[PDB]
Design a protein around this ligand. Sequence first.
Ligand SMILES: CCCCCCCCO[C@@H]1O[C@H](CO)[C@@H](O)[C@H](O)[C@H]1O
Ligand SMILES: CCCCCCCCO[C@@H]1O[C@H](CO)[C@@H](O)[C@H](O)[C@H]1O
Lengths: 63, 66, 69, 53
Amino acid sequence: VHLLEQQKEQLESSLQDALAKLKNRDAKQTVQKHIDLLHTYNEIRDIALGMIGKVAEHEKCTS
Amino acid sequence: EKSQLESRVHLLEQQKEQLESSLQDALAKLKNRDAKQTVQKHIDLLHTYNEIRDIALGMIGKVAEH
Amino acid sequence: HLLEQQKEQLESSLQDALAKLKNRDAKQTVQKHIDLLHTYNEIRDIALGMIGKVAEHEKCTSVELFDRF
Amino acid sequence: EQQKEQLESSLQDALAKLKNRDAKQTVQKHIDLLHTYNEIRDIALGMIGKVAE
Ligand SMILES: CCCCCCCCO[C@@H]1O[C@H](CO)[C@@H](O)[C@H](O)[C@H]1O
Ligand SMILES: CCCCCCCCO[C@@H]1O[C@H](CO)[C@@H](O)[C@H](O)[C@H]1O
């Protein structure tokens, strides 16, 4: 029963590879979504600093 | 001649008086509405500075959290 | 989740601030114009007033030259 | 008034910065939709290749 066992090995792997490939894409997409969210945040933070800076330099030229 | 030229000279003096009161009063009504407009630039800029200040704080209150 | 929660409340708040600030410059532009119109009407009225009086003076002189010459 | 430039502009730059971020994120969302579906088509065929075989 070599064809019987060679056949089943083919079957188990095609499921397992399918899963391995689907798991490793989401590994990559998720880490990537995180990084992308970090940069989105550094940016809106730097917008805040920016805006508070210009408010402080407006403030220090009246009384 | 002399009666009537004393009419004309009077008249003119009366006219000079009105013309100065007019230039006077135009310059007033102007300057005033000029002032009113400068107060308004200032108040509008106050409203703007607060709006942008409040959104700035908001962000700095939030980037505090994260 | 709040990628989108805090980004959109910000963006709304910005576009609004800008709306408001732009509305304020516009209101006060029509006001510059309304005021220029007020000043022009006044200067005009006066200047043409002076012109009428000198008009009347010129009529007198002329009437004098005629009843004379 | 030069102050009003500063402030207005600080709003206009904030909006600009993050209307653009979206633009770019949005094009990219599209490209990923396409690429992912090509990975799914291929996994599918992988299995079907090594089953019917
Ligand atoms: C009835 C009159 C009320 C006057 C209110 C004026 C408030 C204007 O507000 C402020 O005026 C300061 C000085 O002119 C400026 O330095 C500031 O930039 C301006 O925002
Ligand atoms: C591990 C190395 C990762 C490198 C970090 C990437 C640097 C940020 O590059 C990013 O590209 C984005 C694409 O959506 C643009 O939207 C942004 O403008 C920008 O911050």
